[PDB]
């Protein structure tokens, strides 16, 4: 009956077409999607292999130190950080099916003690103007769990005041919820967007919700809620992070990012480091494309060997912009493009996985991180990514705060 189990799990997360090439790899038996799908209605290491497709739980499961849910989770950006702490997810909102994918390869999801959601006005009735406030807070109480930390990556959009916007549904879920603590993540820019009018919404509206927001009256060009990636990887990506204490319970006390830096790498991970040395032939630019990509670059290269790649930083500005160099000869390249021997040295893409290594889902030299869909969609995915190791540092300064939390309300039980 487990293989059955397995096999439901398995298929939220893959093609038919991959697990059958999967068990076709383990070279004992011949597989087609039809006697896949005869089985879901046969074992040994075949098993043994498919399990290795799923996450594990953490070591420390069952039990964990604190509640926390998963808002625009993405690829589970924002997660990894906080099940770092001994966190446990217990409700995830991510409406990109192909996300949700690859969130489900990465992290272990019980449905005992957590559930998935894809368009969260279906819980929070946003969109029904004649659900009362309070109504409406109790339905989304009837889907959303109690929790200690709520996590949540926004759209920027313009704007009771909130109204019309994915904000406004994050709003109803704190105040329907009331967690100790909560982290959002926004674009760089909010502070200016809209003359400024998106920020000072956003910010008033948290305060009235009962809720101190770190850094909240730090506003000007060093504004300690804006968070680079360039502190633990080699390119500029910044983000603004709203972390909010709610006001009764007295958690905030001297916390600030400012103390970011304390979480910063000793030594920064290099660009260099996060590349295969080998990849497959299909990363290598097509001749076409090497001339739509020339004449753009005319109109980020990466020398891998070339000791400047140790220090540097890719801009704002991967498998497809971001190039590695085969050892191209500019002056060929300008007096004859075709030149068939300068065109065996056509630069290559960066592969999912280095991608992958670029945001933090991926260490150095390895390759833990499942990506269960197509290179298209990966790269979508890594691209509309938080990088990782921001907020993992974020998690760092808030686990005190988060212990404390915890303590307060099992005290407050008796």
């Given at each position: 009956?487990?293989?059955?189990?397995?096999?439901?799990?398995?298929?939220?997360?893959?093609?038919?077409?991959?697990?059958?090439?999967?068990?076709?790899?383990?070279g004992?038996?011949?597989?087609?999607?039809?006697?896949?799908?005869?089985?879901?209605?046969?074992?040994?290491?075949?098993?043994?292999?498919?399990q290795?497709?799923?996450?594990?739980?953490p070591?420390?499961?069952?039990?964990?130190?604190?509640?926390?849910?998963?808002?625009?989770?993405?690829?589970?950006?924002?997660?990894?950080?906080?099940?770092?702490?001994?966190?446990?997810?217990?409700?995830?909102?991510?409406?990109?099916?192909h996300?949700?994918?690859?969130?489900k390869?990465?992290?272990?999801?019980?449905?005992?003690?957590?559930?998935?959601?894809?368009?969260?006005?279906?819980?929070?009735?946003?969109?029904?103007?004649?659900?009362?406030?309070?109504?409406?807070?109790?339905?989304?109480?009837?889907?959303?769990?109690?929790?200690?930390?709520?996590?949540?990556?926004?759209?920027?959009?313009?704007?009771?005041?909130?109204?019309?916007?994915?904000?406004?549904?994050?709003?109803?879920?704190?105040?329907?919820?009331?967690?100790?603590?909560?982290?959002?993540?926004?674009?760089?820019?909010?502070?200016?967007?809209?003359?400024?009018?998106?920020?000072?919404?956003?910010?008033?509206?948290?305060?009235?919700?009962?809720?101190?927001?770190?850094?909240?009256?730090?506003?000007?060009?060093?504004?300690?809620?804006?968070?680079?990636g360039?502190?633990?990887?080699?390119?500029?990506?910044?983000?603004?992070?709203?972390?909010?204490?709610?006001?009764?319970?007295?958690?905030?006390?001297?916390?600030?990012?400012?103390?970011?830096?304390?979480?910063?790498?000793?030594?920064?991970?290099?660009?260099a480091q996060?590349?295969?040395?080998?990849?497959?032939?299909?990363?290598?630019?097509?001749?076409?494309?090497?001339?739509?990509?020339?004449?753009?670059?005319?109109?980020?290269?990466?020398?891998?060997?070339?000791?400047?790649?140790?220090?540097?930083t890719?801009?704002?500005?991967?498998?497809?912009?971001?190039?590695?160099?085969?050892?191209?000869?500019?002056?060929?390249?300008?007096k004859?493009?075709?030149?068939?021997?300068?065109?065996?040295?056509?630069?290559?893409?960066l592969?999912?996985?280095?991608?992958?290594?670029?945001?933090?889902?991926?260490?150095?030299?390895?390759?833990?991180?499942r990506?269960?869909?197509?290179?298209?969609?990966?790269?979508?995915?890594?691209?509309?990514?938080?990088?990782?190791?921001?907020?993992?540092?974020?998690?760092?300064?808030?686990?005190?705060?988060?212990?404390?939390?915890?303590?307060?309300?099992?005290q407050?039980?008796?």
């Amino acid at each position: 009956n487990a293989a059955q189990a397995m096999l439901e799990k398995l298929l939220q997360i893959y093609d038919v077409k991959m697990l059958v090439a999967q068990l076709n790899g383990v070279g004992e038996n011949h597989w087609s999607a039809a006697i896949l799908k005869r089985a879901l209605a046969l074992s040994e290491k075949e098993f043994a292999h498919l399990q290795t497709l799923l996450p594990k739980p953490p070591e420390h499961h069952p039990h964990y130190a604190f509640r926390f849910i998963d808002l625009f989770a993405g690829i589970g950006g924002i997660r990894r950080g906080f099940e770092s702490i001994g966190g446990q997810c217990v409700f995830t909102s991510e409406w990109n099916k192909h996300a949700v994918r690859t969130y489900k390869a990465n992290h272990y999801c019980d449905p005992a003690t957590h559930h998935f959601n894809e368009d969260i006005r279906d819980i929070t009735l946003s969109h029904q103007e004649g659900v009362s406030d309070e109504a409406a807070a109790e339905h989304i109480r009837q889907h959303i769990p109690e929790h200690d930390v709520l996590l949540a990556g926004f759209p920027c959009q313009p704007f009771c005041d909130t109204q019309g916007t994915l904000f406004f549904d994050v709003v109803r879920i704190i105040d329907a919820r009331r967690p100790a603590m909560f982290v959002l993540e926004n674009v760089k820019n909010l502070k200016s967007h809209d003359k400024g009018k998106t920020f000072r919404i956003i910010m008033q509206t948290l305060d009235e919700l009962g809720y101190d927001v770190a850094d909240a009256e730090d506003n000007g060009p060093d504004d300690p809620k804006i968070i680079d990636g360039k502190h633990f990887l080699p390119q500029h990506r910044e983000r603004i992070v709203l972390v909010g204490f709610r006001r009764d319970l007295n958690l905030k006390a001297d916390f600030t990012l400012r103390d970011i830096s304390e979480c910063f790498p000793a030594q920064r991970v290099t660009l260099a480091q996060l590349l295969d040395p080998m990849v497959e032939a299909k990363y290598i630019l097509t001749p076409v494309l090497w001339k739509y990509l020339y004449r753009y670059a005319k109109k980020g290269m990466v020398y891998p060997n070339n000791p400047q790649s140790v220090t540097r930083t890719l801009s704002a500005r991967d498998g497809a912009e971001i190039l590695i160099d085969r050892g191209w000869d500019m002056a060929t390249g300008e007096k004859d493009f075709d030149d068939p021997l300068n065109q065996q040295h056509r630069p290559r893409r960066l592969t999912p996985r280095e991608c992958a290594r670029l945001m933090g889902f991926e260490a150095p030299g390895e390759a833990k991180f499942r990506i269960p869909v197509s290179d298209t969609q990966a790269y979508r995915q890594f691209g509309n990514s938080v990088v990782v190791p921001v907020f993992a540092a974020v998690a760092k300064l808030l686990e005190p705060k988060i212990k404390q939390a915890v303590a307060l309300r099992q005290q407050e039980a008796q």
